[PDB]
Ligand SMILES: O=C(O)c1cc(Br)ccc1NS(=O)(=O)Cc1ccccc1
């Protein structure tokens with residue numbers, strides 16, 4: 001059953017998300033997943049996003065039908081800039 005949440009991290013007290021991502025989307029097949037979360041990042045601090053959650057959107061960028069390589073580069077660009085980061089995930 002679909003369980004999709006949108007989480008805003010203010011990135012004030014944290015210098016990175018602290019996630020690894022695996023997989024990519026065949027239309028409707030696979031997806032980009034949170035592989036691991038490290039303590040001391042913004043994602044661990046919030047605690048709602050877990051390994052096995054599917055990454056759907058970050059800020060104004062959709063991650064459905066994005067390659068894993070492209071997803072890593074987009075995330076680096078966003079985390080290396082100041083401001084809040086809004087992640088939309090599908091819970092496992
Ligand atoms: O080892 C890397 O190149 C790496 C790059 C990114 Br971007 C994120 C994590 C990476 N290493 S890892 O083996 O997955 C360990 C880890 C996992 C989450 C956050 C930071 C490091």
Ligand SMILES: O=C(O)c1cc(Br)ccc1NS(=O)(=O)Cc1ccccc1
Nearest residue numbers: 016017018019020021072075076079080
């Ligand atoms: O901040 C992250 O977790 C991150 C994840 C991915 Br996938 C790609 C880039 C990321 N941010 S980053 O600052 O460019 C590299 C990083 C990744 C994990 C921990 C600390 C730094």
